[PDB]
Amino acid sequence: ATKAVCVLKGDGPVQGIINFEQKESNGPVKVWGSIKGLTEGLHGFHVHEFGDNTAGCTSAGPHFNPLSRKHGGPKDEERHVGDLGNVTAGKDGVANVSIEDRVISLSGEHSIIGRTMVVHEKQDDLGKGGNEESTKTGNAGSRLACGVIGIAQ
Amino acid sequence: ATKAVCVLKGDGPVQGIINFEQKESNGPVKVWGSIKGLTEGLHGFHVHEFGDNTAGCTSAGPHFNPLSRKHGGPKDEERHVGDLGNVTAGKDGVANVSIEDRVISLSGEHSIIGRTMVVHEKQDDLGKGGNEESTKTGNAGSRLACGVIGIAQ
Ligand SMILES: [Zn+2]
Ligand SMILES: [Zn+2]
């Protein structure tokens, strides 16, 4: 029953804590937590390749894409492993995250342990924006806050 | 051929970047980088068990100890896996770290990916301080900076 945690920090007001849980080996991963400081609405929410914060969110690299696919939403079969879609902030500025995903894992080749959770500036278009950036980043924009995903108890 | 990296931050002056490189699987890990903000002399330098930064360096737990052993130095047979000994800060408060270890790994059960690098306040006594603290922490004192260890390019 693996568990992970991620503390999200950026250059601005956006901060939060994301929990990860996988009760079965290679079974679904439950992703839940809270992010505050956001503008109201949808924000891209992706696992990026590298858990490298040496240069802020920038050195986390691209959406985690071990199987070399195009960008999609969580419910797409065309997607990066790291494609978790959007999270929704209320007028509050808080996004209560609750996601369940079978593509990310906390063990093996698709493990996101040691990688980076990034919350983005803009709504993720889920690869339907009809341009090359869409199939890359979802047009999700800049990286507002991130942290390395670590093993939790 | 694995690489990892860690940005150490804390509440005070201490901060650094620590790189890990394992050329061969199950082979030596090279841990190198620099930390500034330190008082001159030797400072405990250990891998702690959890990549949990939710309450600062505290939530990192104890030294990484998969084999349930007592605190030792890196050269000792009786050591924790995360027991990397001391690092040395020069007069300018800068510690050039260059360690080669064979017990920590970047994969398998002794993998330090997703765990926490902590630099400590005081010198690590290597488990020989003659008390309980010694056999736990090396009497290395408080956690001055830390970061989660993540996959690097
Ligand atoms: Zn993507
Ligand atoms: Zn120890």
Domain ranges of chain A: 1-153
Give the method of determination.
X-ray
Contact B130, A29 (CB under 8 A): no
B54 contacts A5? CB cut-off 8 A? yes
Helix (H) or strand (E) holding B60: none
Interface test with A, best of B48, B52, B57 (most A CBs within 10 A): B52
Structure-block tokens of residue B95: 């510690």
Calpha distance B133→B47 (Å, rounded):
17
Neighbours of A73 (CB within 10 A): 17
Instruction: Give the distance, in angstroms, between the CA of residue A117 and the centroid of all CA atoms in the same chain.
Output: 4
CB within 8 Å of B79: residues ≥ 6 apart: B69, B70, B71, B72, B73, B103, B127
Query: Given the structure tokens 């630099």, which residue do they identify?
Result: B119
Instruction: For residue A48, say whether it is annotated as part of any ligand binding site.
Output: yes
Calpha distance B52→B83 (Å, rounded):
19
> To the nearest 10°, the Cα dihedral for B42, B47, B52, B55?
-20
Calpha distance B55→A150 (Å, rounded):
14
Of the CA atoms within 13 Å of residue B104, those in its CB half-sphere come to 33
Q: Which residue does chain A place closest to B55, by CA atoms?
A: A7
Calpha distance B74→B126 (Å, rounded):
8
Structure-block tokens of residue B73: 């130095």
Q: Is B43 a catalytic residue?
A: no
List the resolution, Å.
2.2
Contact B31, B102 (CB under 8 A): no
| Alpha-carbon radius of gyration of chain B | 14
Q: Looking at the structure, give the CATH architecture of the domain made up of residues A1-153.
A: Sandwich (2.60)
